[PDB]
Amino acid sequence: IKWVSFISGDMAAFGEWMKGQFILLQIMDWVLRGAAQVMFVNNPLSGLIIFAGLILQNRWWALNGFVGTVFATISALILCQNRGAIAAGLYGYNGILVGLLMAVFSNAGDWYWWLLLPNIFMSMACPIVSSALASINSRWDLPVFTLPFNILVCLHMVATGHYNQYFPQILIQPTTSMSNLTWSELDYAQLFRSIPVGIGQVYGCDNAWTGGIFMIALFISSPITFAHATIGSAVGMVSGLALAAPFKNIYMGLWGYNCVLACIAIGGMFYALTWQTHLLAVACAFFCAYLGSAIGNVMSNFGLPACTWPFCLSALTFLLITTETKFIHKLPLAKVAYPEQNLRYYWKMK
Amino acid sequence: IKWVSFISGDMAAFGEWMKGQFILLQIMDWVLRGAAQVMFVNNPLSGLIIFAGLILQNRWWALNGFVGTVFATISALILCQNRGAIAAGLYGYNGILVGLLMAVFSNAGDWYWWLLLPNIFMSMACPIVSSALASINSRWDLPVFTLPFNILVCLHMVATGHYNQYFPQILIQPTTSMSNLTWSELDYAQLFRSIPVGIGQVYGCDNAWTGGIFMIALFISSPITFAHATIGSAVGMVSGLALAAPFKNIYMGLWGYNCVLACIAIGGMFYALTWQTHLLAVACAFFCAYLGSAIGNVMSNFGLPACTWPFCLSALTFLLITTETKFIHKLPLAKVAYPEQNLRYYWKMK
Amino acid sequence: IKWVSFISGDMAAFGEWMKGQFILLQIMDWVLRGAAQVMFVNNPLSGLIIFAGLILQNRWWALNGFVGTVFATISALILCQNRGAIAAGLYGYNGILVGLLMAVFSNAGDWYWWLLLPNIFMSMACPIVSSALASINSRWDLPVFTLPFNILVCLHMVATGHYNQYFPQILIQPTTSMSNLTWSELDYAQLFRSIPVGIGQVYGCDNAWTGGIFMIALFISSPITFAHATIGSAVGMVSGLALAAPFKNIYMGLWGYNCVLACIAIGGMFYALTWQTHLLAVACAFFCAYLGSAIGNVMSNFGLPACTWPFCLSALTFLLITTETKFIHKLPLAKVAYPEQNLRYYWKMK
């Protein structure tokens, strides 16, 4: 009971205890804590679970993610960006995403040690871009989200491109052939297995076991996040079916990571939870899937993956709408927390 | 005399009378009224005339435009976006443009009933994007314009693309051949006929009779709008000649719809009318044509038409310039009306 | 001594004296003064030196730059944009860049007299876009930089493209072949000669003598600008080596003009000079080189050069970061001057 409360939420007691210890242990929390905040979680335990899932899939990707997030945190410190924001991990999840997605899309092969240096440089530059986006987005009271990650990875990726001698990348070509979609060949087992692999694809992992581990991590923190995550993956696969995407893309979960993230964000994290806000989250996740198709097709010309760009665009657009009803209530950015605490704050204010 | 005044302008008396009647009649005004406000008109009569022109050209396109605008209005209501703004049609013209331009560019053929569903979804999502753009553009006191339409249609279009099984689109390929322009083959009859078809191309109509019907609708509302519209089409065709565009493009009016809209906007709608503002409108329409060429070439790589994107970019840029003279006077967005009333307000203030 | 002080800085005494003379002499200062403010200099003498360097390389390019900047100044006057800002040359450097880079990339051949007309139109439109960007960027207290130049040249360029009958352009194709980089074939003489040609490439000049002339002009104004300029070119060539760019590109200086400009801007012009700000300038120039590779690859699909786009993006991002230390101090835009005067102001305030 008490222990379950302790391991839930943002882990506040652990937070004070870690305050006392040496700078080195702390940097570990701040990196474990920021590892799991891609999915809007401030739980170090869940972050360790996320890391375990990364190790399970591929050791090289996990090592790159770890080094990227640790160097993003170190860069946030050296720049004196903020304390209490770095300590909550707001500067590390961009770094881990940059490292992981640089390791995923690199054609140089596994254990290519020279990949660390661009990884280091991109991850260190993440706090700079995060502060730059925070300066712009603070006028409208909007969060940075995953935009630094997108900007930095897209740079490495286009800069170098597939035809590079030192840091080659994977081929991304625009579609130029009519993909006949034999509906009788659809497999329902993989179609429903697209739910865990879809949530696992947030970090580039396409292993159903890693997706299940990520779902376990989300459930440990807050069941509401888990529910919105699984419903986001479901609407992502449904939209992929509706837009005649190849069945392999749906099975791999390429249509689900933007939707799961967008449903987590709008439904419980930044909008106070309500049935109206729940349908807003579902509509936002559908629009995020459809815009994800659009973005993936647009970015294919340059030779780049869609990444988390659709999620940012949809989440910002929804987070910006103004309404004449009191049910859809945007929370002030200073008082945003895990969705249960946000609902508690909404109840206390009302 | 009195009747002519009644059918002119924004139609204010009709506006109060319609206030009383059932919600269903009202939704019809609000859709008729918003049909004609692509060209910045609040006249239901003109909207009916615009609809008649659409029916004249192609029944399928007109049906798609009608359903798109009605569902945009319904979505504005269900979201409680605003009343008095929905009642003026500020949320319907984006919907009708989305529906019409989805029907125009769809390669599935006429009377393809499955086209309604993406049409419904895009049109319903128009108020969301309109509010999102209004949140950003209200800081600088700028209007949303046709930006939601552009964003939503470009999404459907790229998402799906030509190589799609369910919702195929038309081919748009970048130019890769030297187009020899035999100046002796120019036809002056079609060159001057490019004026009505250019204004008709605002809705995707390339019929000279439909363009003339649209010009009649504009004249019914306000002669100043008609004058700026025809001069915008003229500068569009002149710029198309100056940039060595193929003569067929000029004849079809592909070079005129952005210019006519931009000249209508800057000259009388948002800047108080003056000879200085008139030359500003002409320069804005020339820049809009030249940027329209640029945008049409840029978007051709992705497989998308230029759409109304050039108009938005030019109009915003001009609406943002700051000046040290009192002749170019930007009106406050709350007190914008038909250009005659705007000039009356300018005279009353001065 | 006194004369050296007179020819240094912003040339203030000359500034008052020129105030009295006829409008025609003045327009010459305001064009000479704005010619050299691409590199953030308000010295007419240096501007004449910049012009001499342009003449040295190619007469046609220099003539186009002169006419572009004079028409940008005339357009700033006719629009009543500002006095004291036009008199300082804030509206002319965009014009000279537009003219020079239109003359450089035009495939019609030297002394193609019809190139003046698009040159005139783009250069006259530069104050409009400059005011539009100033309206947006004044909220965050940020400068327009070279953005109007980029927007206007990219328009001419895409609009027309290589396959145009009247205004053909040069081929820019995306890389599709594996460039084997024989490290033994590197030449150190040209590798170090990439420093002056890199700074000369700011205006499109790829002559080492013209680069040296530009360096002399920078030294005349302020030695700090010269130091940051040469270190920016050095980091540009180093980054070009690190990203496996073809050695010819590094030798020509295609990797240095964005970095030299960004190091000049962040290090001394807009951030008060400090060792912390100096390392910030070096990091900004490295990020500017790497983003320059990214942008050059992205824009290659449309058929356009990278231009000064990377510089703008990097400079704005760095100029937007918020920090918790007092060493990195962003100056108010009203009180920005040559870096020596900025350091003097910083010392006086502190």
Short mmCIF file of C-alpha atoms in Angstrom, two decimals, chain A residues 51-331:
data_model
loop_
_atom_site.label_atom_id
_atom_site.label_comp_id
_atom_site.label_asym_id
_atom_site.label_seq_id
_atom_site.Cartn_x
_atom_site.Cartn_y
_atom_site.Cartn_z
CA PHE A 51 16.21 1.22 -20.08
CA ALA A 52 15.80 -2.51 -19.47
CA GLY A 53 13.48 -2.69 -22.45
CA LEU A 54 16.04 -0.89 -24.59
CA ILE A 55 18.76 -3.31 -23.47
CA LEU A 56 16.47 -6.22 -24.25
CA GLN A 57 16.05 -5.15 -27.86
CA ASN A 58 19.55 -4.02 -28.88
CA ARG A 59 22.56 -3.27 -26.69
CA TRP A 60 24.05 -0.76 -29.13
CA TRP A 61 20.87 1.33 -29.34
CA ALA A 62 20.52 1.34 -25.55
CA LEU A 63 24.14 2.39 -25.06
CA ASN A 64 23.67 5.25 -27.52
CA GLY A 65 20.48 6.34 -25.77
CA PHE A 66 22.19 6.28 -22.38
CA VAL A 67 25.18 8.31 -23.54
CA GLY A 68 22.92 10.76 -25.37
CA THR A 69 20.73 11.44 -22.36
CA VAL A 70 23.67 11.71 -19.96
CA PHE A 71 25.38 14.23 -22.23
CA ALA A 72 22.15 16.18 -22.67
CA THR A 73 21.94 16.44 -18.88
CA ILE A 74 25.61 17.44 -18.62
CA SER A 75 25.08 20.11 -21.28
CA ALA A 76 22.02 21.41 -19.43
CA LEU A 77 24.16 21.74 -16.30
CA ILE A 78 27.14 23.42 -17.99
CA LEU A 79 24.81 25.95 -19.63
CA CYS A 80 23.06 26.65 -16.31
CA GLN A 81 19.75 26.12 -18.10
CA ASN A 82 17.82 25.32 -14.91
CA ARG A 83 17.80 23.21 -11.76
CA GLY A 84 14.58 21.53 -10.75
CA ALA A 85 13.86 21.29 -14.46
CA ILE A 86 17.03 19.34 -15.20
CA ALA A 87 16.44 17.45 -11.95
CA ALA A 88 12.99 16.48 -13.22
CA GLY A 89 14.48 15.22 -16.49
CA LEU A 90 13.05 17.88 -18.81
CA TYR A 91 16.41 18.08 -20.63
CA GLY A 92 17.25 14.38 -20.90
CA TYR A 93 14.43 12.75 -22.85
CA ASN A 94 15.32 14.76 -25.94
CA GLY A 95 18.89 13.52 -25.56
CA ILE A 96 17.91 9.86 -25.23
CA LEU A 97 15.60 10.13 -28.23
CA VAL A 98 18.37 11.76 -30.28
CA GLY A 99 20.86 9.05 -29.34
CA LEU A 100 18.47 6.15 -29.89
CA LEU A 101 17.20 7.39 -33.24
CA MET A 102 20.71 8.17 -34.45
CA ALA A 103 21.73 4.62 -33.58
CA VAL A 104 18.61 3.16 -35.21
CA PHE A 105 18.93 4.88 -38.59
CA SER A 106 22.72 4.60 -38.98
CA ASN A 107 23.79 2.30 -41.83
CA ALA A 108 27.37 1.99 -40.52
CA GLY A 109 26.47 -1.18 -38.60
CA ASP A 110 26.27 -2.16 -34.95
CA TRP A 111 29.04 -1.15 -32.54
CA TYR A 112 30.27 1.62 -34.85
CA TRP A 113 32.21 3.55 -32.24
CA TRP A 114 32.53 6.70 -34.35
CA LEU A 115 28.76 7.17 -34.00
CA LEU A 116 29.33 8.49 -30.47
CA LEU A 117 30.83 11.80 -31.60
CA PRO A 118 27.84 13.07 -33.64
CA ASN A 119 25.69 11.56 -30.89
CA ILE A 120 27.59 13.59 -28.29
CA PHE A 121 27.37 16.80 -30.30
CA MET A 122 23.65 16.49 -31.08
CA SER A 123 22.77 15.50 -27.51
CA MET A 124 24.79 18.36 -25.99
CA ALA A 125 23.05 20.80 -28.34
CA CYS A 126 19.61 19.61 -27.21
CA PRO A 127 19.35 22.02 -24.22
CA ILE A 128 20.19 24.96 -26.50
CA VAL A 129 17.38 24.15 -28.91
CA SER A 130 15.07 23.32 -26.00
CA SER A 131 15.64 26.77 -24.51
CA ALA A 132 15.20 28.37 -27.94
CA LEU A 133 11.84 26.62 -28.39
CA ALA A 134 10.85 27.44 -24.80
CA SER A 135 11.45 31.12 -25.52
CA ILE A 136 9.05 31.01 -28.48
CA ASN A 137 6.44 28.69 -26.96
CA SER A 138 6.25 30.40 -23.55
CA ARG A 139 4.32 33.31 -25.05
CA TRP A 140 1.39 30.98 -25.81
CA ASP A 141 2.00 28.87 -22.67
CA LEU A 142 2.94 25.77 -24.69
CA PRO A 143 5.51 23.02 -23.97
CA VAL A 144 8.61 22.24 -26.07
CA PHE A 145 7.58 18.57 -26.45
CA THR A 146 9.86 16.49 -28.69
CA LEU A 147 10.72 19.29 -31.11
CA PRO A 148 14.40 19.58 -30.21
CA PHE A 149 14.80 15.83 -30.81
CA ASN A 150 13.15 16.16 -34.22
CA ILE A 151 15.23 19.17 -35.26
CA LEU A 152 18.54 17.64 -34.17
CA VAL A 153 18.00 14.18 -35.67
CA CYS A 154 16.72 15.53 -38.88
CA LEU A 155 19.84 17.59 -39.16
CA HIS A 156 22.20 14.74 -38.69
CA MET A 157 20.25 12.77 -40.98
CA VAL A 158 19.95 15.09 -43.90
CA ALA A 159 23.37 16.46 -43.50
CA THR A 160 24.88 13.16 -43.81
CA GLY A 161 22.29 11.29 -45.87
CA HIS A 162 22.70 7.79 -47.26
CA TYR A 163 25.51 8.81 -49.63
CA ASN A 164 28.07 9.77 -47.01
CA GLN A 165 31.45 8.19 -46.41
CA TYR A 166 31.69 8.52 -42.62
CA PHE A 167 28.10 8.42 -41.28
CA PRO A 168 25.88 6.67 -43.84
CA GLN A 169 22.16 6.30 -43.19
CA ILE A 170 19.26 4.10 -44.31
CA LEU A 171 17.36 4.54 -47.57
CA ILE A 172 14.04 6.40 -47.43
CA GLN A 173 12.51 6.69 -50.88
CA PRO A 174 9.16 8.20 -51.91
CA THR A 175 6.48 5.79 -53.03
CA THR A 176 6.28 5.41 -56.81
CA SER A 177 4.35 2.13 -57.22
CA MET A 178 0.72 1.10 -56.78
CA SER A 179 0.60 -1.07 -53.65
CA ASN A 180 -2.21 -3.55 -54.19
CA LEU A 181 -3.69 -4.30 -50.76
CA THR A 182 -5.06 -7.85 -50.65
CA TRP A 183 -7.52 -7.54 -47.77
CA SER A 184 -7.81 -11.33 -47.53
CA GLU A 185 -4.11 -11.55 -46.58
CA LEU A 186 -4.59 -9.48 -43.40
CA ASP A 187 -3.56 -11.33 -40.24
CA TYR A 188 -5.59 -10.47 -37.15
CA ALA A 189 -3.00 -11.77 -34.67
CA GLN A 190 -0.35 -9.32 -35.87
CA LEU A 191 -3.01 -6.64 -36.35
CA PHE A 192 -3.81 -6.73 -32.63
CA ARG A 193 -0.14 -7.29 -31.74
CA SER A 194 0.39 -3.89 -33.35
CA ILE A 195 -0.81 -2.36 -30.06
CA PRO A 196 2.26 -3.18 -27.88
CA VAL A 197 4.79 -2.81 -30.68
CA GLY A 198 3.19 0.54 -31.53
CA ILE A 199 3.86 1.91 -28.06
CA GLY A 200 7.32 0.34 -28.13
CA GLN A 201 8.06 2.18 -31.38
CA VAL A 202 8.20 5.46 -29.42
CA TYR A 203 11.88 4.72 -28.77
CA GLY A 204 12.44 2.95 -32.10
CA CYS A 205 11.88 -0.48 -30.55
CA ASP A 206 9.85 -2.86 -32.70
CA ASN A 207 9.84 -5.79 -30.28
CA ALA A 208 6.49 -6.77 -28.79
CA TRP A 209 8.20 -7.72 -25.53
CA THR A 210 9.83 -4.28 -25.31
CA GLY A 211 6.46 -2.68 -26.01
CA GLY A 212 4.93 -4.71 -23.20
CA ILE A 213 7.75 -3.64 -20.90
CA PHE A 214 7.05 0.00 -21.78
CA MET A 215 3.35 -0.55 -21.07
CA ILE A 216 4.29 -2.02 -17.68
CA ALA A 217 6.41 1.06 -16.98
CA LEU A 218 3.49 3.33 -17.89
CA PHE A 219 1.11 1.35 -15.68
CA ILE A 220 3.50 1.61 -12.73
CA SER A 221 3.40 5.41 -12.96
CA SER A 222 -0.26 6.14 -13.71
CA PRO A 223 -3.02 3.85 -15.06
CA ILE A 224 -4.60 6.79 -16.89
CA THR A 225 -1.46 7.19 -18.99
CA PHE A 226 -1.54 3.46 -19.77
CA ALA A 227 -5.17 3.66 -20.89
CA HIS A 228 -4.63 6.69 -23.12
CA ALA A 229 -1.49 5.05 -24.51
CA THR A 230 -3.19 1.81 -25.53
CA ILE A 231 -6.17 3.67 -26.99
CA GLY A 232 -3.76 5.88 -28.94
CA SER A 233 -2.05 2.83 -30.42
CA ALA A 234 -5.47 1.39 -31.27
CA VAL A 235 -6.58 4.52 -33.12
CA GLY A 236 -3.21 4.59 -34.87
CA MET A 237 -3.64 1.09 -36.27
CA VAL A 238 -7.27 1.82 -37.19
CA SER A 239 -6.22 4.93 -39.11
CA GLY A 240 -3.47 2.96 -40.82
CA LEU A 241 -6.10 0.50 -41.99
CA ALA A 242 -8.36 3.35 -43.13
CA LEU A 243 -5.61 5.03 -45.20
CA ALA A 244 -4.64 1.84 -47.08
CA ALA A 245 -1.15 1.70 -45.64
CA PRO A 246 0.81 -1.52 -46.29
CA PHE A 247 0.00 -4.14 -43.68
CA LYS A 248 3.67 -4.57 -42.75
CA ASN A 249 3.84 -0.93 -41.65
CA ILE A 250 0.85 -1.42 -39.36
CA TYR A 251 2.26 -4.68 -37.98
CA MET A 252 5.62 -3.06 -37.19
CA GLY A 253 3.87 -0.22 -35.36
CA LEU A 254 5.06 2.56 -37.66
CA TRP A 255 1.54 4.05 -37.48
CA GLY A 256 1.14 4.10 -33.71
CA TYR A 257 3.90 5.96 -31.82
CA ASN A 258 2.72 9.45 -32.76
CA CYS A 259 -0.88 8.58 -31.86
CA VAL A 260 -0.01 7.00 -28.52
CA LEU A 261 2.09 10.01 -27.57
CA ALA A 262 -0.55 12.52 -28.70
CA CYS A 263 -3.33 10.73 -26.82
CA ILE A 264 -1.18 10.66 -23.68
CA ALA A 265 -0.43 14.38 -24.00
CA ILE A 266 -3.79 15.95 -24.79
CA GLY A 267 -5.99 13.59 -22.80
CA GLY A 268 -4.43 13.70 -19.35
CA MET A 269 -1.16 15.60 -19.25
CA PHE A 270 -1.95 19.12 -20.41
CA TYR A 271 -5.76 19.20 -20.59
CA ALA A 272 -7.68 18.44 -17.41
CA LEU A 273 -9.31 15.04 -17.81
CA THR A 274 -12.98 15.02 -18.79
CA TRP A 275 -15.15 13.00 -21.15
CA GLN A 276 -15.02 16.03 -23.45
CA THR A 277 -11.23 16.02 -23.12
CA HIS A 278 -11.22 12.26 -23.72
CA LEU A 279 -13.00 12.63 -27.06
CA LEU A 280 -10.66 15.53 -27.78
CA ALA A 281 -7.74 13.16 -27.19
CA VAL A 282 -9.24 10.53 -29.50
CA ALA A 283 -9.83 13.11 -32.25
CA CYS A 284 -6.32 14.49 -31.75
CA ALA A 285 -4.84 11.01 -32.07
CA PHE A 286 -6.80 10.36 -35.27
CA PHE A 287 -5.64 13.69 -36.71
CA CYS A 288 -2.12 12.82 -35.54
CA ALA A 289 -2.21 9.52 -37.45
CA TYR A 290 -3.50 11.19 -40.60
CA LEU A 291 -0.95 14.01 -40.35
CA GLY A 292 1.64 11.33 -39.63
CA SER A 293 0.92 9.79 -43.00
CA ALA A 294 1.16 13.25 -44.56
CA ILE A 295 4.47 14.07 -42.86
CA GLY A 296 5.99 10.66 -43.57
CA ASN A 297 5.21 11.14 -47.24
CA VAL A 298 6.54 14.72 -47.28
CA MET A 299 9.83 13.91 -45.51
CA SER A 300 10.39 10.86 -47.73
CA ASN A 301 11.63 13.09 -50.56
CA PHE A 302 14.58 14.34 -48.51
CA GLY A 303 15.43 10.84 -47.31
CA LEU A 304 14.20 11.19 -43.75
CA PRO A 305 11.72 9.34 -41.52
CA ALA A 306 8.58 11.05 -40.16
CA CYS A 307 9.88 10.77 -36.57
CA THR A 308 7.91 12.50 -33.81
CA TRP A 309 7.11 15.49 -36.02
CA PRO A 310 3.43 14.58 -36.49
CA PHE A 311 2.95 14.36 -32.75
CA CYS A 312 4.33 17.83 -32.15
CA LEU A 313 2.22 19.46 -34.83
CA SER A 314 -1.04 17.86 -33.74
CA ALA A 315 -0.45 18.37 -30.03
CA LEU A 316 0.39 22.05 -30.45
CA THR A 317 -2.60 22.68 -32.71
CA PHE A 318 -4.99 21.12 -30.22
CA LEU A 319 -3.27 22.78 -27.27
CA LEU A 320 -3.87 26.12 -28.99
CA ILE A 321 -7.61 26.01 -29.70
CA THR A 322 -9.75 28.50 -27.80
CA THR A 323 -13.23 27.44 -26.71
CA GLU A 324 -16.33 28.94 -25.11
CA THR A 325 -16.96 25.98 -22.77
CA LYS A 326 -15.45 25.26 -19.36
CA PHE A 327 -15.07 21.49 -19.81
CA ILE A 328 -12.00 21.66 -22.07
CA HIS A 329 -9.67 23.43 -19.63
CA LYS A 330 -6.01 23.91 -20.56
CA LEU A 331 -3.78 23.70 -17.50
#
